[PDB]
Amino acid sequence: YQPTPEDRFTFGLWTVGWQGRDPFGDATRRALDPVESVQRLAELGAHGVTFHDDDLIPFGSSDSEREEHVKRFRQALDDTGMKVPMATTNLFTHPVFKDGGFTANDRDVRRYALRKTIRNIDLAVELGAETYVAWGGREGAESGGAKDVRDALDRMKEAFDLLGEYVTSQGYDIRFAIEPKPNEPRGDILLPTVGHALAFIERLERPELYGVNPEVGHEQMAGLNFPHGIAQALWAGKLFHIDLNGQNGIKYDQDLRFGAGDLRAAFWLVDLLESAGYSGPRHFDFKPPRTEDFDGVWASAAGCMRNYLILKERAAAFRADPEVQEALRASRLDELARPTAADGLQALLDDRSAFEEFDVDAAAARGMAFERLDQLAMDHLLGAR
Amino acid sequence: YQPTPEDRFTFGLWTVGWQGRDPFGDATRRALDPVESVQRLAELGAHGVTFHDDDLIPFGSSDSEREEHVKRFRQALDDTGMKVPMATTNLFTHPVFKDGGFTANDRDVRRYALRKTIRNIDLAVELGAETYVAWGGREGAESGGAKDVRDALDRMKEAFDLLGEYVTSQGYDIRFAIEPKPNEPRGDILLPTVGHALAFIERLERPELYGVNPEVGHEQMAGLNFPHGIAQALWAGKLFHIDLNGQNGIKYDQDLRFGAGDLRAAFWLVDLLESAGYSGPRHFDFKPPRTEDFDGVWASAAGCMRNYLILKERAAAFRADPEVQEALRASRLDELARPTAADGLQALLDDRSAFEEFDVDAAAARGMAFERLDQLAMDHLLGAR
Amino acid sequence: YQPTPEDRFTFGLWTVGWQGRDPFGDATRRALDPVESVQRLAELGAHGVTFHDDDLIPFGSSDSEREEHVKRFRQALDDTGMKVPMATTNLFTHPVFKDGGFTANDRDVRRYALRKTIRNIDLAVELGAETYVAWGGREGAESGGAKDVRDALDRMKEAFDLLGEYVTSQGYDIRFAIEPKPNEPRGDILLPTVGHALAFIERLERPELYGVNPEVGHEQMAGLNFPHGIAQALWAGKLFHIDLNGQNGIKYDQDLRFGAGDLRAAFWLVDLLESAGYSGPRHFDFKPPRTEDFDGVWASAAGCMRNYLILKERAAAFRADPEVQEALRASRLDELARPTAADGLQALLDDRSAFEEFDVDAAAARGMAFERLDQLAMDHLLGAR
Amino acid sequence: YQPTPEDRFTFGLWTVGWQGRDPFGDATRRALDPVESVQRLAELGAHGVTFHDDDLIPFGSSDSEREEHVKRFRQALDDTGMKVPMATTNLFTHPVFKDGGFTANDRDVRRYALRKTIRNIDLAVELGAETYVAWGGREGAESGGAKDVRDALDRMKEAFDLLGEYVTSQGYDIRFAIEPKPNEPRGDILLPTVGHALAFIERLERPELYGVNPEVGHEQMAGLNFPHGIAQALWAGKLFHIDLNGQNGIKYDQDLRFGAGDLRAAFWLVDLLESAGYSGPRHFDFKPPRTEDFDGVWASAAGCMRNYLILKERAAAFRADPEVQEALRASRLDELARPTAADGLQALLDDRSAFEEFDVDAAAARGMAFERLDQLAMDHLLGAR
Ligand SMILES: O=C([O-])[C@@H](O)[C@H](O)CO
Ligand SMILES: O=C([O-])[C@@H](O)[C@H](O)CO
Numbered sequence A, B, C, D: 001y002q003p004t005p006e007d008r009f010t011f012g013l014w015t016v017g018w019q020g021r022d023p024f025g026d027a028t029r030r031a032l033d034p035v036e037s038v039q040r041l042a043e044l045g046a047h048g049v050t051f052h053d054d055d056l057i058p059f060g061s062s063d064s065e066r067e068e069h070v071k072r073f074r075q076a077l078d079d080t081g082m083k084v085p086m087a088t089t090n091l092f093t094h095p096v097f098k099d100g101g102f103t104a105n106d107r108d109v110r111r112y113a114l115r116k117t118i119r120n121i122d123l124a125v126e127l128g129a130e131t132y133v134a135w136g137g138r139e140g141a142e143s144g145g146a147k148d149v150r151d152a153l154d155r156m157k158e159a160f161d162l163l164g165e166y167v168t169s170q171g172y173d174i175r176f177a178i179e180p181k182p183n184e185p186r187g188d189i190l191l192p193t194v195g196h197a198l199a200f201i202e203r204l205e206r207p208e209l210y211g212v213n214p215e216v217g218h219e220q221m222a223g224l225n226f227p228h229g230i231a232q233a234l235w236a237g238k239l240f241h242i243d244l245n246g247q248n249g250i251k252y253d254q255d256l257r258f259g260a261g262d263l264r265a266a267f268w269l270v271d272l273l274e275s276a277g278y279s280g281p282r283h284f285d286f287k288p289p290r291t292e293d294f295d296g297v298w299a300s301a302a303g304c305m306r307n308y309l310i311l312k313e314r315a316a317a318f319r320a321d322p323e324v325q326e327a328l329r330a331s332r333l334d335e336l337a338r339p340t341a342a343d344g345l346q347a348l349l350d351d352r353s354a355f356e357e358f359d360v361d362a363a364a365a366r367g368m369a370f371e372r373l374d375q376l377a378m379d380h381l382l383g384a385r
């Protein structure tokens, strides 16, 4: 289960770079140089890295330090063959963003948020990114009077429309991916789920520029079925990117390595990405636990990839099993894929077999046979066929 | 705090009619006649009632019993002045619906679900309903292999498009309202939140026929901020109807009377409906606890209305208070309502005050003053100004 | 992975017997005869069954019907070799129990609850049960004023002390096991977790007669770590019995078959029961989903046992792996098992290496190596070593 | 609603002192001097303050800096009349504690944790504290193999027994209060609830030295009823201290000011503390949101006290209302307080009215009248009688 660059595994700088500061504790690990992380991830078999502006260029850098940091970065990419498929903006760490970036009550802050974003879109384009992620982690409230949400959605729409105007005017080939989260660090965050982000996108001036970047642990913080929300994003044509990690139910965001947390959900996710043929990056947004030293960091990054590859194998074996294919027909998955009424509405209304003469007790009596199908899935996951 | 019919308070037949059967216990109360409920609710000050088909007409009724049940109903409405603003279909109780109605794997079931729905749209129109609710409580799964969600959304879209075709062909003035729920009675339900239903509506052939019917307790079962999700529905123009009740956090749907559960959320909800000028029904989808006799039923129904009226008064007092209006300006709610960049994109990019010369430390230092604003809200709710 | 009676797998009558009535739907399956369930479970390899009084003897049975039902039951046990290790009382279904059994506000109800319980303890003893389970599913409240919890604990203590007096006066060899649940069907249930039940037991007159019966899905409805709570019960010497099932996070009790739900938790549970040498029944308190026909019932019951046996094998392989044993030492699990200060308090206080001369930066720098250990556990679970 | 020192309101140094660093953002406020906080809280009407060792004395302070910090502190207390009723140890911030203090896998760490604790017990005694709090926020795990919980409880018991030996040998008048939390910052924390801490205390060598310090938001992070868990602590005689704050359901610990979060729970809590006559400190463990400047800090601290006093008034009015007293009798709260069977076991068994002749249908038919009682409580809370 060895990754290669063709598996499209990517990692944020901030993930293996996390120093282990939590709301209750100091850093447990020294800061990593981005060029060290690029080299180490390349050796583990990753395909590329991603970044916040402030991960790569220290906040407040002069134009001469900026160019130096970028030059060193670019030399590490050249030396390793690593790519940069995605980039994003930090609109959450600096105190100026304490009430949000694009929906901060202070208008001057909202203008600054857009300027900081636009500067990094130029850099992302230069480094070859295809996807620009937006996680509005500070957009929201701890109290009901602090935020008018209708006004706040107006401001959010305004920001993303200006960003779409910018990209089209520059002729850039870059699309946006909005990342939902229900809470943390705000009491409640705006566009808290995949469904809310999809809905929002349909009100933008150019909807085709925008999709979603869902994260495993974010949807699970609302107790939601992550493979179901991804299915809906896939159905809408809007899965531009994805963030992979693990989460043990409804609590703070744990950012565990991928395959930890809800292991059956992880299985069904890989089953779906692979059978839909998702072709974007498999990006890990995770944190090596602060218990770990740098050896435990690279072990944790490597287990992300390993668990993806093991679950790919098991899901492929599942779908390829003739016994499973028979069980799928036993459960009428083939009938779910057929139109309900391709005959059309009038034929439906004239069909006595659909109502007047429908035997509802014989239909009610048919078993769905889902438990046998689910134990086949369990046997396949566990390698116990 | 006496309701009148002009407050637009409505109740489902199934709410005061709930016999108290739960997954662990038998009924504790005898079945109510719909005409008794109509009379009793009228005396309490309600404006109207709503129904599932099977609430009003016993499942399997002959065309002659059907007409009898409708005739008696209609006489009670005439005798009381009660209206019927909304109706809906039961696609969840009968065993035939054990795998869903519109997304049941069995195609014959899906055709039957549509026929049963269409029959009751005709009746709803006859009784004057303006809104037709669809809660797909059986659409979903307990296991990952049982349901392909992309196929299932295809089937769901197909069903609602056929219903839109029906209504337009009949020339009916009726709109649809999809009611989300995240789980229960299915392991996971399709379109689990307001955001997922809004998003889904944008893929229908005629989106303007469809809005949402959110329920307090449903969104709270995902730990979500109900007033935030309603704000988003209002922003999209899609709040066609609403279901009011109470819920104590993430557990089974409790259906407590409105104002129980999360009381501050209830306050902020009423604040928002009243200040947005929502004009639809204030419908209660609640269950008098099975501890109660018929006296406790009507006491519980009456407290729904009472708590709405008390919170309306307190929210109105809050917004009218000059001290609050000053606090709102202190917190820059006035600035949230102003465009970020009406000057447009090029002016933004040339504005040195937005970036080059923006003093981010002075901006970071400004307090938001949200805690003083939130304690004013608390003092107003509690009548402690 | 074939069970035999020596695996000590047991099932409630109510589990494979569940007709599929839920708060939103009618039964989907006909009632099973207890003697049919005994025969079917025997053929699948189970060791025994358990019962509520009202599962075996229809509520209101005459003394002559009672004896008939028991006689038929007893013939099926004799014909199959099945045992009855545990029994319990239904104090939740009948409407008289709507406010509880042992903590009902009505004193006459509380006396009736005890009489109904005592009658079934005699029967349990006759059928050979060693453990008497008490799940007070109706003990609790939907509202704060309805229940004084101090008085209610007085009443609960009183009930269990009278039951301990009864058993000792009869000379029975039977112990009690209290089953916690946090909510459902009450808004909140008294003794909501393992910890609350353990604590409560220490105030009874004869604490040694009482232990706990934890259920997987119950603790998970509070978002708690089930193997951690079982460890604590084992540490206290109070794991008298256990209920096995699956649960997908914080929602209604799903009662999924064992191994569904949280699969890694299931792994760590089996690891702990087997390495502590728990020797009681492995009892399944589950419900075949109402999607299923009788074939899906027996498939679901069989997957309970199968998943237990697969996880036993994987956990045994994990602990036996020399590479794992090395990793456990790398992570200092050996040091956790050593006394902190067997040298005693004064030696601790005089030890300059414990404070004055303790190098806290060198200690802070040591990695715990937990991620490598956790990926070994993952590889072992998935059969990917 | 003005507090005075006789209300026994206390605050941690770390609460108004929180600089606003969160897992995603830098500090938004400068560090406060402890002597400034003492002066400011005194002016607001507080009775005293509490501290971690490291709040008062910077970690690594020399014996000469230590004495200086203590001397200045003590002068502020003398100048204001503020007391120090409780103190505690920081065993969570420094990286050495990344795997715990008293249950760290490294034995040398566990010895250091005890030495650091003992040093601050001496200081607490000198400053007059009566209660010593222990929150083991780092005791737990992110993965199943990292922590044997039986060994870990052995180590936890060992630590608290050595601390009990120390206090008794010094002749100190100080008791311990264990503070539960279910998760955060560890994946799962040991003794996750009130019930688990109560149970644990019963295995210590001297149980009478130990009680609990529950926190509102901690129990609510498990979805539990906080007034119910406090009732159980009161029933056991173990409420030594309490931490007051607000929490909006199951997510990260929000630490909102008291009365925010679940307002009805806050009402029922104050009702219970006041009617049980709890006489310990009313301590606020809260964080002014990082949106706030120092003015919003003191406004937030003041609203803690204000909301307590308003809810005290409303709960007192509730219990004093003759209409409520009648409703309480209607709901049979008077009967809950009477023994079930003071007549004893044999009389119970011979009582034909308890079983043979018990009319279970007439008993089942009685309403509990809880909804009318709960609306009286609602009217009283809202000042709408
Ligand atoms: O999820 C988060 O928390 C971030 O890493 C987000 O993906 C990018 O800002
Ligand atoms: O919410 C539910 O559970 C139903 O009352 C729905 O509003 C209509 O079918």
Ligand SMILES: O=C([O-])[C@@H](O)[C@H](O)CO
Residues within 6 Å of the ligand: C012, C088, C089, C133, C134, C135, C179, C215, C243, C285
């Ligand atoms: O858990 C439940 O819900 C019951 O089966 C309990 O174990 C026995 O009454």
Ligand SMILES: O=C([O-])[C@@H](O)[C@H](O)CO
Residues within 6 Å of the ligand: D012, D088, D089, D133, D134, D135, D179, D215, D243, D285
């Ligand atoms: O609750 C926490 O998080 C701490 O303030 C605890 O009360 C004392 O260490």
Ligand SMILES: [Mn+2]
Residues within 6 Å of the ligand: A179, A215, A243, A285
């Ligand atoms: Mn992310």
Ligand SMILES: [Mn+2]
Residues within 6 Å of the ligand: B179, B215, B243, B285
């Ligand atoms: Mn509803």
Ligand SMILES: [Mn+2]
Residues within 6 Å of the ligand: C179, C215, C243, C285
């Ligand atoms: Mn159980």
Ligand SMILES: [Mn+2]
Residues within 6 Å of the ligand: D179, D215, D243, D285
């Ligand atoms: Mn605390």
